[PDB]
RNA sequence: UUGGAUAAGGUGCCUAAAUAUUCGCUCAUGAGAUCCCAUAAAAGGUGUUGGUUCAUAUGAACUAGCCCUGAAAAUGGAUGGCGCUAAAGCGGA
RNA sequence: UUGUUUUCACUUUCUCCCCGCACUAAUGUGGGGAAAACUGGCUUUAUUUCUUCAAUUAUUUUUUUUGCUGAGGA
């Protein structure tokens, strides 16, 4: 509900959607960075290793890329922990442009704002 | 776009295509020349394209008129303005797109024995609704004050004729040849005679 | 009840402006489109501006709409029914050898030539080279022996 | 498949319920059929729909099924008649159009462009109710009855578009629209 | 797949049924309306 | 007769361009018969030779060349963006340029 | 837009039709005229056998359907023209001056006097295949015939314009020179 | 800085990119053509295109799209220009 | 007060019959009647390389031709 509510002021100016095991795996292996260092000080690294996932999220037994995959994908008990740790995904721009940034997904003319659901991951393929 | 020159007979094209087109061939740097400008057709009625040429030419700068827009009633000269408005000619490589450009009204001397292209992309014919109305240039030309449409068109019906006579000759020797050809075609090797029927020579 | 022997020749020389209507089973040329350069069948029409054709299995076009403006219509039809499905059309065409029809008229022998053509591997093109030099040869022997 | 000739219309089936609450237990389930570019729109206009004709809103609802739904014969042409609400610069009219293709889908296509224009109505101002398959001897619409003809056929005026590889700048000679 | 195949027909041919039976009543009511 | 072309014929329009702004990284070239993006894709990987003269003599020779490569078609009308070793200069467009058989 | 509608129109007996490319030739015993319908997409089907021409037009809107019966009353018209002259026979009617007509050049060229007393002569002349007489029955009369419908009308009304009466109350002077019937030969 | 891919906006020429595809509408003897934005109304039309409700394929009454009238200013003039009507205009896809 | 059940009306013809009997856009046609069943649909058995095995999504594995870049020096 917090999250949904805090969305819901910020729709127009975002698009989101469901994003299935294989775009989550995609997104965490090829465009997946993370806080290595010591707190408010974290310097985002690249994985190319477990070694700093199990460092920061071993606590948790989450010593793995695919640890992490599986705790995003379904929301298990280390999930703001994993995120937190994952830094901002910085997308490139989608491959074949946007419909209309302006206007929402929702709209029949073309759009793009608004809550895409499983639309979302041809655009983040697009997009990574 | 890559040859020497083309010529460009400008019967029965519209004159913003034609232009247009035009323009693009000469900014790219292929030299054309455009013949028969007095045929070129425009949309919408005589009407209303001498009323359009009418408020062009109470266009002048009161000042001095010498200075201002010159008119040009040849349909040839017409269709170098319009392409020059297509164009940045205030520059030196749109100055020299422009001069690339040659424009005639009939066929004179060294382009009436040439062959001649047709833009199909601005054929009357194809652009053009049967039920909607258009002009001739030489017709508004001749309303505006150009007043060399007959003598063009008298030059014209010479030309015919002797490209008639020419094409006679023409088709008298191709058939010639095409027969020389069946005849020789039997002394050649086999082998040449099927790799030619094969391919369709 | 009948026409003697005024209606062959009358009706024959009728002559009408316009031939190759778009009836189910008028063989058309696909010049526009992923099918472009395909010969299909109209096998009923939908709209003014759409129809469906279904080249049978043998020309490679599935059965589809497609609008008509894409569509050159040929000569040749064949006499189909109004719905006819694919295996009867197969079957007509088949019996009917129409494809056989349309590849001896000038436009089919003129698209096998081009194709073939095209496809022409270097030393073949150089064959074809080779041929036309000696034709060009005897031609100009026989030509000058005919002054 | 030509997807320069296939449109983003497709027909959903969608079963929707409020919430059960302490006063009902179990609330009347609605069901609709929705054209929409996908599901995700068609959802959309199930709750606008919801909200207006019950007093359902999404936020006290729930998804019970959403499905495309698939002609049956996607190759088969029949007549279709369709009953239409859309709202223009100064009223609201239904208008009842007929249309007639393969899929139900492609006639809604065919409606949203002749909506356009012909009324300069747009998809937002449009609202779609009961389009059905009509029979031949039902047809109303005289540009439809002419092409239900015994044996239908005409010309083929339309002027050649060939492709770009063709469609050269410089030509030989005049072409012809006759061709045929 | 067959038992699959009748049922999948069956749960289509009801929704339309459904939507057919939707029609006419609204039909009726607007004929109703109508005197 | 005699001095064989293998080669394609181009033509050099502008550089890599917007309205009123310029990338002169990128030339747009136009090759002969090629007029859609699948067939100026053929031309991707091949050489280009700028060949110019020159009103006197740099190596004993009139003549000299500017290298580049086609990199990706541009647009939908079969024109290609080519980089050379160095800009090629805008006296230079709308002259002939050969896209080279090789590689 | 209606796919096909044609209308159909029957050849009198003594005519001979040519149409090629909507160019169309009718000869008669009172001479030949010559239509160009080129301004119209239609399909004309001369049938010179069984007689009768029909005008097809395809895919026609209501705006281009209502030329197929235009053309149809042209050709009806070109047909019973060349086979009967059409005539308009003219009234010249006047209060106080006699209008004095003259017809020279061979039934062309008629030349009026004493409109409304002005003493200055005002001539017209005759479209190609048209004749202007007097009619021998009353006295003022004029006939005005020929093969051409247009032509005919055209120059009846050339006639009545010439003899227009200018800065007098019209409804009240009423001298000039009237189409009082239109018939055929 | 080097490549890539996009936003806004565009792809007839000026001007890089569609004389793209697909479906309708419109002929203007002062057509129309991107928010701000560079004016237009009441009232009309037997122009044409769809709809609605009444009367045995006819007569009416409405309705709303584009078009037209209403619509006059001073240096010569501006959809930015050329020009465009099987749009390069309008509404979509 | 929802289901359930019933009626007719729905197709092609390069078929036949009558009327207009050549009247059509037409190498046919308009109106009025019959016919089976080629066509179209369904029910069984064998096959899917004669032919098809699509499309979308989820989940995977490759592939043609190629642009740009090479920081560092453990």
Redesign the interface.
Known sequence: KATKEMLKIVEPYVTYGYPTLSTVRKLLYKRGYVRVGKVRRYARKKIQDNADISKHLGKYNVHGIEDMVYQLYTCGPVFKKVNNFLWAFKLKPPRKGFKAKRHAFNEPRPGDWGNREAHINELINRMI | ??KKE?V?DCK?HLLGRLAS?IAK?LL??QRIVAVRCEDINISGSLYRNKLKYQEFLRLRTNTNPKKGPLHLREPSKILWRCVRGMLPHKTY?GQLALKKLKVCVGMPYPYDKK?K?????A?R??RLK??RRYCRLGTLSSRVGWNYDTLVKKNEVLRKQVSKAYYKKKVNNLNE?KE??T???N???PE??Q??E???? | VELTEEEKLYISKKNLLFKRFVEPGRLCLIEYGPYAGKLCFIVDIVTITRVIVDGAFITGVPRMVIPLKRLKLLKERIKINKNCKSGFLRKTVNSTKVLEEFNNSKLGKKMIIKKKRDEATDFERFQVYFAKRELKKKMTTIKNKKN | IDNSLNTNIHQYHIVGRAIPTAKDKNPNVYRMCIFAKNDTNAKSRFWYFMKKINKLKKSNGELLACEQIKERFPLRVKNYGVLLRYDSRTGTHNMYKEFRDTTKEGAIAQLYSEMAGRHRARASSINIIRISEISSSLVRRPHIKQLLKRRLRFPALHLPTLQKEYRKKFASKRPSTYRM | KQIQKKELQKINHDYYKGVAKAVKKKKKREEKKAK | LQAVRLYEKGVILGYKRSQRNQDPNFTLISIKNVNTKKHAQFYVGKRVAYVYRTTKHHDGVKIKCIWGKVCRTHGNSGVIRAKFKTHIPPKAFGDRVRILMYP | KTIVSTQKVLIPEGVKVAINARKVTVSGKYGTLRRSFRHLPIDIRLNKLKKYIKVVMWFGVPDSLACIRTVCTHLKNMFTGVTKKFLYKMRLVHAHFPINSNIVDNNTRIEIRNYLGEKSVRFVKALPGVVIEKSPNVKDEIYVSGADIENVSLTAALIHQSVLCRNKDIRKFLDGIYVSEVTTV
């Open positions: 776009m890559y083309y460009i029965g087109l061939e790219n740097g490589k062959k292209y047709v833009l199909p992309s054929l014919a194809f049967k039920h040849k020389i050809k005849e020789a075609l002394l050649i090797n040449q005679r790799v030619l094969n391919f369709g020579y």
